Request: fold
Amino acid sequence: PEEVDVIVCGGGPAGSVVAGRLAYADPNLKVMLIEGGANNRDNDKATFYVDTMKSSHLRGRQSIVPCANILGGGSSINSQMYTRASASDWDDFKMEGWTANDLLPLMKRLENYQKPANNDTHGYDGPIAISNGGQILPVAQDFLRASHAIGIPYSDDIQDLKTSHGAEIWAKYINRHTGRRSDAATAYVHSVMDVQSNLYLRCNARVSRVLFDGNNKAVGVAYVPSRNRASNIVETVVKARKMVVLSSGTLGTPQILERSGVGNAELLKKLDIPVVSDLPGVGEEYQDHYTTLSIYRVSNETETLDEFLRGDKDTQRELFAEWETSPNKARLSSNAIDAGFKIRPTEEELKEMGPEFNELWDRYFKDKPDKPVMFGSIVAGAYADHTLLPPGKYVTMFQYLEYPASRGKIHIKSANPYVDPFFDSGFMNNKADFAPIRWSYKVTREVARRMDAFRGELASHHPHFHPNSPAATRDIDIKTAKEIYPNGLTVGIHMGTWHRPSEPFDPSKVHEDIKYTKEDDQAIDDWIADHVETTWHSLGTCAMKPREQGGVVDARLNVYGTENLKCVDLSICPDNLGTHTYSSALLVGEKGADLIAEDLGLKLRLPHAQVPHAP
Amino acid sequence: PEEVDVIVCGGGPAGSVVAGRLAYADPNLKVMLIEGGANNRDDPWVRNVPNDGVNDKATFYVDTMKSSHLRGRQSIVPCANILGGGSSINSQMYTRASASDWDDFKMEGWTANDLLPLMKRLENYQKPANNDTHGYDGPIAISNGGQILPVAQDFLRASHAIGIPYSDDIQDLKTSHGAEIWAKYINRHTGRRSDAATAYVHSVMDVQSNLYLRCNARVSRVLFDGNNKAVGVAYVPSRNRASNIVETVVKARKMVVLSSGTLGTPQILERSGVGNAELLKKLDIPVVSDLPGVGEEYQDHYTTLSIYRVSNETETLDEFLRGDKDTQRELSNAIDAGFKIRPTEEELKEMGPEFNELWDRYFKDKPDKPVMFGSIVAGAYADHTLLPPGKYVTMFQYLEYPASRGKIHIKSANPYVDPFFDSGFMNNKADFAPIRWSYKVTREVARRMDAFRGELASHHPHFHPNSPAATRDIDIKTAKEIYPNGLTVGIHMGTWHRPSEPFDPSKVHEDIKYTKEDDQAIDDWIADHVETTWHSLGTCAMKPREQGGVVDARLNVYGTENLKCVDLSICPDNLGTHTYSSALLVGEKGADLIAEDLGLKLRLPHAQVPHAPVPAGKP
Ligand SMILES: Cc1cc2nc3c(=O)[nH]c(=O)nc-3n(C[C@H](O)[C@H](O)[C@H](O)COP(=O)(O)OP(=O)(O)OC[C@H]3O[C@@H](n4cnc5c(N)ncnc54)[C@H](O)[C@@H]3O)c2cc1C
Ligand SMILES: Cc1cc2nc3c(=O)[nH]c(=O)nc-3n(C[C@H](O)[C@H](O)[C@H](O)COP(=O)(O)OP(=O)(O)OC[C@H]3O[C@@H](n4cnc5c(N)ncnc54)[C@H](O)[C@@H]3O)c2cc1C
Reply:
């Protein structure tokens, strides 16, 4: 059509939630969802943002933040892990109607908890399927025992919005009955489109800008094809009688806004864009979660995912056969990340994390006991290029920083919707971020060394310690290297002294913590600098806070200085969230659905449409 | 027996030559050869030196103390522990020192031209020789192997490309800058490795009965009389199984000869009373002659290995070392080509004070001495349980005339206690500069090969990731062939690497530029990964006593009579060569000397070696 009641820009979890809830609320309400990626009903599935300028913090790297480019948003790109923020995280939006207790009903509204529940903070009549997957791999349980061994208590639920130090069997966004991944679009959008026809889906359309009024009321939206295949660039305009909603994700929305005339005035002046609203905060304060990976070598008897990732024929054939014939309990019906923890440093440990982190701590964490500092978890395999990986089997300690101090930004460089924006990831531009990440490298390491499967550290993919230091990396025992190439000459030739072998596995071993110097710390810092990467949990470019502090949206997610325009995706978060952020994006979407429901005098219909090929 | 004419301690190449030549000289002369290792007429049979517990063919000396020069490492120097000595535990390479090396012994009768007839006397050169420095009616059979692996031709082409000229012979005592197809210690007719014992000793025992051979016996010391004449030798079994140590003694009517190798002989001497007097007095060993040079000035060739990754179409030795595909059963030493190189005056300017001083004093006026050796191993000379999948080649490079010196000293009169040992690796800073230089050169060579498909980052210096000289690992195109449906190839997540640009034959090449911090990265890499080449020499120097010498110009231990050292330990300075040919030569000269000293005539040609047809006796 040319005119609809509500236009929602972007098919992320947020946009999908808004469009779905609203369209299902009233068959009269005509909403349209404009998405720049392909329809997912059935690489190029992500758009890649690169640091425009080399970062001095990352030792001359240009960090790359890829984000989703498909219907369903990030939820269509992986078998995802289930995590929720701590309650203080929302209570700290300091925004009316967004407190923990405010959002709790909604946290429940969107969940289909298929697990046994250790508390009363989950939901069951929601579209989004949450389960533990097929089966738990033994390495994970091993990880849990070692973790318990060093003071990380086992818990049956670490997502009760209150646990900050604990480990668990990590649940996944995968339906337990059918074994299919739970993206937001099929759960919220396609489910509706199959039973109603007032939800218009317009994919492969990159929203260029918002069309405004004389009184700055959102009147419509102009979109251009997703790829720039023509000599001329042509806008399709579609009007919105009631509401325009921007859900193009953290990297996506501030560009729409800035090229609509909403943003920093000085920039728009530089860019020949008529100014609609002066908001220097648009695109600023970019936040993320910083990932480091510690790769360790394990006994060959261990069940890991490596043959699959290398691509052996009979193993890929066997596992695909199994995920085909019995997805109910199939190992491939998992993300092979079956266990992890949220951890916090002890007042004893704090004494060694420096001025910078102690300031950040005293200020941010000290009074909020439910906020974790770090996340860690065990990947039954090596999350790295296997053509640079020695033969054998691995696990990976996947760890990320929960609430980084560093900030980045993204700003358009042209009014043209097809030009790359200026981007600064911001990774490590605040020194107070090295200290906790460093700590994790240590913590996880300890855990790895206490596992029944641990057979060594992968020297190359670990920090570059001074060889003579007690903290050096010890690689595989001769026994395991012998079982890897039994009839192989060369195993164990010391010629070159290319490694230092571990003493073989004596389960009757008592462990003493590795002692680290300042020099060793500097090695870990360099490693962190060299290899830290995004976690794809981008947020905060269109912050929700008072304008005078640099906000862009209302307590009702209305863009300041306009009417009928809302930003409801992850970009609105004023401060970071201690979680994998899909659950957050869904929650922000649900809240947004509520707000727009209120604004339009609408009553949401629940429960939602039956998700396709689902019970 | 309890009495023989000549006792020889150690069955190495030198010791084998002495025993064989003498026993064959006069059938009446009863000689006995005592070896601390096993007999080498093997049953089962480079991969011959790792401590697997299954290594009984080598003894491992470990640095008593950690080396600050080597960033806290204790270097490990393995030596041969078997009859034939080092010549029995590998597929051997043929190399000769340059003539300046011998001329510089400054010992009468050890000049290059003096020894040349001896050099020919031992060679059975079976490749065509386009010069006049080889022998043809000699025992040790030398050839070029069958055919050359393609990567070697590749390497040679690259070498020429950076100015290392091709030569048909690098072992003519005269070249210091050139490359060649490397010839080996293998008989071309029968395809068998020509170790020194089976060539010189076993040939005699098969035809005569006056050469007694005693294996598994560790010569503990020399028995001296009142005028410090060697009367015999005391030896113990080499496996210290017995609860008590009982010495077996055998007397010597004519001569005692010590040939137990560079790490072995100075110990015998020290437990005999010949050595640092303060030391022995500390060890309650009665002093026979104070010779502080004994056990001192240990020299070697320092090896570093550069591993580079190559294309999968390439034929290398790797699948073999991995053992896969029943190829170990189906199946040269796969080091078929290399070079001797010397730095150009322009390059000298970037090598620093220490080495430039060394250059002015040592190399400047002697144009035939190469500074570095390099060669290509068609496979990765490294632990494959630490190597990413795929195929590799490695630049095997060693320093020809190192400045560092180490030492070895007994720690007790007990023959079964490990001695104090210091490899000495890199304790003279003038040793870093050339190796680093070499690291650079080979890399360039490596970058210019048609098979080169990347550098193995892990095993290369730790260059700053952002430096232009950082290493770029395998290109994505090859990594794809390694795992066609592999879900992880080309994942950028982690930035653990920087991939190399894929192969276009029409590419023009520019030398890599290095900084001072990049130079330091390489100094640290060198310090971290430098290893011996098993070319140990010099612990019992041949020079005037007042300079710290131990032996005569005729190899007699100072302060005694009827005692000689005939092995590599007598070399006063290093030799720009793999040292087997050198060890054989020392042996021949010693045999000659002992021949004159006892009024004997060597019988030439030698006893016919087992498993050979009649020797050609002409090109
Ligand atoms: C590989 C990957 C793995 C992830 N794994 C997890 C996990 O395991 N657990 C977890 O909790 N979270 C995970 N996430 C993140 C999670 O998906 C996001 O945080 C969540 O989806 C946020 O939703 P969003 O709506 O805010 O942004 P998005 O989901 O990114 O929404 C982006 C959508 O809007 C489209 N769009 C963008 N720009 C425009 C434009 N100008 N015009 C029109 N449309 C546009 C986008 O192309 C896309 O369709 C992962 C993300 C990635 C990339
Ligand atoms: C693995 C290896 C590979 C090599 N490859 C090459 C090559 O390819 N090309 C080349 O030119 N050179 C090569 N060499 C070097 C060459 O083999 C030696 O340098 C040469 O043998 C030196 O001879 P030697 O007289 O010093 O006796 P050695 O070979 O050094 O050994 C002397 C003998 O004396 C015995 N012995 C030692 N101590 C005692 C003791 N107390 N009492 C009684 N007996 C004792 C030992 O068992 C030994 O057999 C290699 C060496 C090694 C270890």
